């Protein structure tokens, strides 16, 4: 989906790099670590810059792990994470990039939106939608849907994967619901509202069958009950929206199926408050009334979610890509300035230390 | 006085060995979830915490999964959410992870506190970081979570004196010739009652000694 | 004698003989023994009713105020005594115990009525 200009690596490969052998830097990190001393962010940056083979990716993974488990783990710079992902893509090691991304706790890989897009798009080009979905879920876990390009790509991948999925688990319900709610809330169009409705339906099914803690625990989701209520509020908002905004028939069908299936440990809620299981029949009545209202107002779209997301992508991804490329070049310039500052600083300490030593 | 130098030598050696053999957070605040005992000491946790220890997350169990260890994010607590209806949370400013932890799920944190909707001026160290009581506010929920309208906090401005003490105040007043009929009265405006669960100063708190 | 930390507290030191208690209200370091060294004796409390059916409590109120203003804490029985004297508000636990006794006696009366 992303153009060649977006995924082009020429500008990254044109960055200024100090050439080192990875063996030498690895040995210096090894000594610093056995002495229980801190390692600089510059040292790991140099090590990740100088990966030159597929085995050097394996070694750089290990040294990323050790830097994460060192006193200066917080100082891992963003250009280093971007370069790590670039190297993994360059030497045919997308599996290693994905492994470090899913185990981000152990390796500290927290990509920016451009780097998520690069990885997700590589997987899409190789038609590896399972791994692309894994990258989508990692985007959701990090709440990195601030850039419209990421939102559009994630929605495309999610709807593609959902079109061909029948046997369907509750952890998968939770993940898909969160991954469709987060980008959906940021899109003020039919895709966004349909995604909101579908994701709320899935999360409400999870809440009703498995409990609310199964929804919010270790997720970027709220701990308040009423996800099905929120789906119905999406329907009500669409009923009062401009002409352009509509709702896909497929999302409505999913919500109806969830309600029809639902109506056929510590207590976290106050005993004065009404439970959701005791509100399901009113949810049915509201769903039917609102479905009739939307059908009367002609606010039901017949195009599938995947096709309609496809046209939305074809309509907006180019502009989003242009914006992302501009920001990316700005980031490269700033990263270059910061790296030269770090190099100057360490050269200064080495010179001062030698001056002290000659005394 | 015969000098006692062995005592001084022992004190200095003990101090040096304690500041070189410091136990880390990953060791001190680890917990065996099956028995709910600290492996470092073997002491069992109190009963009223058991369920939470099996259900809730420590603060850095949340922060280790976030870029920059979640600086600037809002973190609330389950106990606050149950106890109070007004928003209570910390806005993080500085995090010092315990690198020795396998999952980087131990360490210290600093931030600005909002308790029952009232925000503090300065950022201070956060207490109970090692408790299994912490929740992370989603980014898309913060606007809804932080919303708070300060209600009129008009409490009693003054209270009567205790009977005998009031009687003595009045009797002394009459003895000194003053004939005022105004009741003796205790000002309680400057005595602000802090809730018992308000965060305390983590900087003043101690630490378990290695052994 | 230097204690590690500690503070002054106004409390009851027990004297008298077996089956005949008597109390001296004293201000003392909290770490000191119950009947040991004290800073000043601030009163007395005879818990046994006398020939007039009275429990006699003497309170050196000037010195009690002085020691409270010097940073002295109070033991819970001393707070309850000062509440009974009207010097302090009635302690919450006295009110709660009174309510509990009221409920227990109401239950007993209801048992009598039921029988």
């Amino acid at each position: 989906l992303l153009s060649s200009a977006y995924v082009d690596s020429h500008k990254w490969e044109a960055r200024e790099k100090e050439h080192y052998c990875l063996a030498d830097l690895a040995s210096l990190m090894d000594k610093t670590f056995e002495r229980k001393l801190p390692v600089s962010s510059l040292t790991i940056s140099r090590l990740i810059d100088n990966i030159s083979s597929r085995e050097e990716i394996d070694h750089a993974e290990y040294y990323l792990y050790k830097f994460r488990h060192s006193p200066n783990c917080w100082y891992l710079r963003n250009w280093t994470i971007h370069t790590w992902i670039r190297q993994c893509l360059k030497y045919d090691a997308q599996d290693k990039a994905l492994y470090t991304l899913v185990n981000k706790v152990q390796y500290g890989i927290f990509p920016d939106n451009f780097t998520f897009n690069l990885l997700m798009d590589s997987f899409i080009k190789k038609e590896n939608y399972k791994d692309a979905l894994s990258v989508v879920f990692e985007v959701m876990m990090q709440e990195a849907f601030e850039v419209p390009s990421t939102q559009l790509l994630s929605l495309y991948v999610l709807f593609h994967c959902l079109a061909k999925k029948t046997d369907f688990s509750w952890e998968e319900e939770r993940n898909f619901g969160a991954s469709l709610l987060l980008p959906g809330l940021k899109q003020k169009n039919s895709v966004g509202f349909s995604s909101q409705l579908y994701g709320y339906a899935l999360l409400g099914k999870v809440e009703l069958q498995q409990g609310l803690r199964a929804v919010y625990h270790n997720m970027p989701l709220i701990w308040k009950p009423g996800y099905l209520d929120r789906a119905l509020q999406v329907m009500e908002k669409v009923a009062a929206s401009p002409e352009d905004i509509k709702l896909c028939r497929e999302a409505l069908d999913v919500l109806g199926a969830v309600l029809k299936a639902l109506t056929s440990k510590l207590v976290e809620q106050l005993d004065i408050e009404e439970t959701e299981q005791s509100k399901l029949p009113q949810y049915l009545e509201r769903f039917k009334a609102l479905h009739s209202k939307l059908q009367a107002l002609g606010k039901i779209e017949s195009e599938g979610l995947l096709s309609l997301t496809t046209q939305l992508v074809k309509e907006k991804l180019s502009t989003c890509e242009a914006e992302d490329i501009a920001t990316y070049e700005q980031n490269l310039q700033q990263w270059h300035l910061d790296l030269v500052q770090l190099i100057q600083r360490e050269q200064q300490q080495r010179e001062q230390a030698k001056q002290e030593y000659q005394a | 006085v015969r000098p006692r130098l062995i005592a001084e030598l022992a004190r200095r050696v003990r101090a040096l060995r304690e500041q070189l053999n410091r136990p880390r957070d990953s060791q001190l605040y680890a917990v065996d979830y099956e028995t709910l005992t600290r492996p470092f000491s073997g002491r069992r946790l109190p009963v009223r915490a058991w369920a939470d220890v099996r259900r809730e997350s420590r603060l850095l169990q949340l922060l280790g999964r976030l870029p920059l260890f979640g600086l600037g994010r809002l973190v609330t607590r389950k106990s606050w959410l149950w106890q109070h209806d007004e928003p209570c949370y910390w806005r993080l400013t500085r995090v010092r992870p315990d690198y020795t932890a396998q999952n980087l799920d131990h360490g210290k944190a600093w931030g600005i506190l909002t308790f029952k909707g009232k925000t503090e001026s300065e950022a201070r160290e956060i207490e109970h970081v090692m408790y299994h009581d912490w929740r992370l506010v989603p980014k898309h929920e913060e606007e809804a979570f932080t919303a708070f309208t300060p209600a009129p906090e008009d409490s009693l401005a003054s209270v009567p004196y205790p009977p005998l003490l009031r009687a003595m105040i009045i009797a002394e007043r009459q003895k000194n010739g003053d004939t005022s009929t105004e009741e003796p009265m205790l000002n309680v405006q400057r005595i602000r009652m802090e809730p018992w669960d308000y965060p305390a100063k983590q900087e003043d708190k101690g630490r378990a000694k290695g052994t | 004698k230097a204690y590690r930390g500690g503070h002054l507290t106004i409390r009851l030191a027990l004297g008298g003989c077996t089956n005949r208690p008597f109390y001296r209200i004293v201000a003392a370091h909290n770490k000191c023994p119950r009947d040991g060294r004290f800073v000043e004796q601030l009163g007395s409390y005879d818990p046994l009713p006398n020939s007039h059916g009275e429990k006699l409590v003497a309170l050196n109120l000037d010195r009690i105020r002085h020691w409270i203003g010097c940073g002295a804490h109070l033991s819970k029985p001393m707070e309850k005594l000062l509440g009974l004297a009207g010097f302090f508000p009635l302690h919450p636990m006295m009110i709660t115990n009174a309510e509990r006794l009221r409920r227990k006696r109401a239950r007993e009366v209801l048992l009598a009525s039921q029988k």
């Binding site: 976290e268 004065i272 | 106890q83 | 309510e99 006794l101 009221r102 409920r103 006696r105 109401a106 007993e108």
Partner: peptide, 30 residues
């Protein structure tokens, strides 16, 4: 107390609750 505070306490002390006591007798029972 308000019913909401009582429900909050009943949630806080799940499984370790005793029978809720109403207002006490106004006077000392005889």
């Amino acid at each position: 107390p308000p019913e909401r505070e009582l429900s909050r306490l009943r949630r806080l002390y799940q499984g370790h609750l005793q029978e809720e006591s109403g207002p006490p007798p106004e006077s000392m029972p005889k």
